[PDB]
Amino acid sequence: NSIQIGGLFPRGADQEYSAFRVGMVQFSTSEFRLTPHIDNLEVANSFAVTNAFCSQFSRGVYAIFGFYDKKSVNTITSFCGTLHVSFITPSFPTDGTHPFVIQMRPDLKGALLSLIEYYQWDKFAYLYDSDRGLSTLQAVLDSAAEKKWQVTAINVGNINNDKKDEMYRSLFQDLELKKERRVILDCERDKVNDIVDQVIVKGYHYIIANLGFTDGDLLKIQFGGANVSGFQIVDYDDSLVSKFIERWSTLEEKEYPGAHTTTIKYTSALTYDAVQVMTEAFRNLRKQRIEIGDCLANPAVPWGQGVEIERALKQVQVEGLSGNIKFDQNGKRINYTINIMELKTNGPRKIGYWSEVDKMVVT
Template identity: 25%
Template sequence: CSLMKLGVAGIFGTQSDVTSMHVQSICDALDIPHVEARWDFQLQRQRLPINLFPRPAMLGKAYVDLVRIWGWTEFCLVYEESEGVIRLQDFFKEAQKYGWRLHLYQFKSGEAYRDLFWKIKVAGDNRIVLDVKRENIYTVLKHAQQVGMMTENHSYLITSLDVHTVDLEDFKYGKSNITAFRIVDMGSPELQSLFDEWSQFSVFGRKTQTHQRTIKTQTALIYDAVKLFAKALADFDTSKTVVFPPIFCESGEPSEDAIGTSIRNLMKLIKIQGLTGEVKFDQQGYRSEFHLDLLFLSQDGFKKIGGWHSSYGINITLNATSEYNSLLLQNKSLIVTTVINPPYTMLKDSAQLLSGNDRYEGYCVDLIFELSRQLGFKYRFKLVEDNAYGIKNDKGEWNGMIGELIRG
């Protein structure tokens, strides 16, 4: 209200759910544009603000699409705040459809993260969808590491769009599969230009060099929000003179020159290219169409291995996939299940007593040898006990090689 007495064009923010509702209520009553850049779980409102954060339902679809590409059928959802359940709700819907087995865990306030990871470890879960605040990501992963939950056999999908801004140096060499999405377009010429401008700034009259060329999602979204608002204001100003008179909350009435509704409607129609890619809205004012980069933590830091688009789904690039797979398999020891079936897998005829992998020959044996040589893994052949490829019985259980794969 103090700001409005000075005359304002619009209100940006806040990040708090409760505060935002108050601000939205005042802006609705006084017809002032309200622009947000935060995750908002509310599916319906009487008067929607313009929100540049991706629509939660579409963001949830990106997580689910990735898990389906990976072929996960059993994994755990680990969250910190109660809103995490809402962010992860799409997994429950898909679980019913595809028969996924989900295990739900929540960090308890006042307890160390490692206490919960001990329980997860005992339960044998090694595929984790992790929903925690950006500022807690490092500590959470550190506690997981302390209890042996950051090995080459563990996979993490982190839901935060800000993982790329967190220093995960301590986890780059553990070979854990850490994957996340990013909405900030790091290839944007506009962003690179901003980094160049920010690289030297004055602190107490001295020039200071900054080295980290990264930006938080909220900062990029606010930048795009201001850019979008300015474009709408400029377009509106061509047809009508815009003024921002003092507004008094006590009146409860918008001024005669209020343009909030007009600006809001105009913003819904405008498309801009921002730091977070193309910015445009559906009829409800939601950002439902957007692109995300798919990131994988390698020894050189986060690398882009593909992307997700609301219209096309997941796309993993070929070169990145090869590097991604080789990183996952380097120095791993694998068990290769097989059956005796010429010419694929055969027992060698030899006058000497053979042991281990030397006992076998055939096309499959040669293929595994070449793959291990190129990707750097070790392996041991194991004949399946019932010598079957695998069929499902009346109880829905598989035998043979398929059964061994399903049982891990």
């Protein structure tokens, strides 16, 4: 009795798709199996996302796993909410009310604000990506007013890959001489290297505002002077993660691009966890004996059973690669722990952790 689902993947999201496939193997049973229909697309393109969503809807999927970005997030939220189709995603979380969107990614804003306070910063630069969310911006600016921080908030997004050289000049002119060397980097991974390379030096302290501090070669040179801190939602010392890596480290690269390593990007980890969440939801519908096509149809015809699937998804409580997984009624992660990292000559290390209830705890 196969369960039809959609998968909407950004082009080039190879490791995430490998993790998706490994999840389907691990969490599928003999009798029950998810049957995904995959669309690879440019997620920044709202026309393309709308077309992919509608195609999935017309097929008759029971839920959609996928990604969005700043330009397409409203298409996903509005279409899911209108048609009662659940969208499970590792993409950036949103603060508004969004029925039918299950956001695998923990919120990071609280942990970031606690870390700023932990280091007792009162003046710093916040370099962010207009090609990314803005909830974190808002939260930082709003806290600055309350905490009396002096924040220099520069949208490093939309760089022509051209004037880039002449734009970092004006960037660092403001910082370098305002003797501002405390810097938060809240952008796409590549933008990190591009900014750090422009600095090279040891008097700086960077906070990397993402959930994958040790992901990829991001830390390509640990001998480089300068304090670097960040966040980690995948704890490689946890039993569940260690067992996963025992397999992931042995996979064939040809079959599973991005695997055959001892680490996994946090977005890929969340993708694997999303498969567990979906499988558990549908299994729970079966246990409870709950039996379960034109996008532009007027009037809109929402899926009648949509609310039952949405409910089952939000009620899932399991441990995964990203730790304890539990959702509130708005599809937001709750009761999750985020590990706080720190830079050392020999590598990264967990100095403490953050939870909603306790804020920051030092190890």
